[PDB]
Design a protein around this ligand. Sequence first.
Ligand SMILES: [Ca+2]
Ligand SMILES: [Ca+2]
Ligand SMILES: [Ca+2]
Length: 341
Amino acid sequence: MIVLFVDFDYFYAQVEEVLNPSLKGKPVVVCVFSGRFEDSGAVATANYEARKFGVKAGIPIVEAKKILPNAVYLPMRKEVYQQVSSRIMNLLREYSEKIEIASIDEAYLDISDKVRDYREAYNLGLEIKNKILEKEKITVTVGISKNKVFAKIAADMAKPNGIKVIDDEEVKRLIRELDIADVPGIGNITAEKLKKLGINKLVDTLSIEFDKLKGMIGEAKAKYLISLARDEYNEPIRTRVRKSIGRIVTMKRNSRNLEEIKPYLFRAIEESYYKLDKRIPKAIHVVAVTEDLDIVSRGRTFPHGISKETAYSESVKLLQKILEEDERKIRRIGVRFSKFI
DNA sequence: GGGGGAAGGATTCA
DNA sequence: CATGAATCCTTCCCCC
Ligand SMILES: [Ca+2]
Ligand SMILES: [Ca+2]
Ligand SMILES: [Ca+2]
C-alpha cells in the first residue's frame, strides 16, 4: 500500500500571509484572545519565523510577547481558514478517490493504485505541492510510506515545505530508533506511562506481556503500538464521519452563578445550532472547564430530535446538575450536540 | 455471562 | 498563563 500524507505548513499563520502578503518573512502569531485581561489567551499557531525563537502553539500570548514583542499578533479567523482548507482538500481529491481528511490541515491519500514504486509516488508528491502552491499560495509538507502512521512521521521529519519518503528499510530502523513519543497518537501522558514500562522505542513494545501493556495504556493503544512495531499496521484510508457539533467559550471571569453563566451558555447554543445546519441532534451535553482546567459534563439523549427551545431548557438543567455536583468554579462553558438523525 | 446503550471522563493535537 | 471533536475507557444499568 502507498499512502501519501499532506500537512499544510503552519496553516493559520500562512493563510494570514496569503491574505496579507506583506507579512511574508515576519514572525506571525495567530492567537485566541480570551478577553479576561489585556492579551489574555493562547497562541493557536505561529509561523517558522516566530517558532524558531520558542513562540509556539499553547503558550500564553503574554509569554509570546516577552520573547518577540515586535512580532505580528493576529486574532484567529477559523471560518476563513476552513474555507481555504476546503478548497485545498477538493484539489487533493483529484489525485485520489481514496482520501481521508484528518483535520483542517491534514489529509491522507491512498495512491496505491495511481502509482507504483516510491519514485512515482514521490513525483505525485512534488506535483501536488506545486499544484497547491500555485492555486492557493500555500506551502505544504508531504510524507510518503507504507501506511498512514509512517507517512505522517515522514511529514513530521520533513516539515516545513518538504517531501520525505520512508521506505520499508527505514521503517525497520525507525521501529528501533524512533522515540516512541514521536509516534502519532502518543502524547506526553502516554509517553510517560510507556517510559515506566521500559518502553522508549517501538521495538520495546514486543518485549512486554500484552496484558501488562494493555493494563497500562489500554487495549486499543496496545494493539496499535504492537502492530506498528511488528510492521503490520495497515489501517485503510477513510475520512471519519462528523459525529458531533458544539462550542465552548471562556468567560471573562470564573463563576458559579447560574445567571452569570447562562449568557455564555446560550451563546454557545446559538453558534452550535447555526453550525449544525440541517442536522438534528438527539443528544446534548453541557461541558464545563473548571478553574483547574478540569473538564466536567452532563448530558442527555432524547428519543427524538432536539429543538432549540428544548436545548435552552435542557442545557440549564444540565448546568445546574454540574454546579450541584461539583464545587469548583467554572472557567469555560459550552455545549455539544450529537446522535444526528 | 454478556449484548448493547447511555453517561462521564481521559487523551490527542493546531 | 491556561484556547473542536474523534477515539477510546470505565462504570452502570436493563435483562435475556
Ligand atoms: Ca498538522
Ligand atoms: Ca499545520
Ligand atoms: Ca508526541
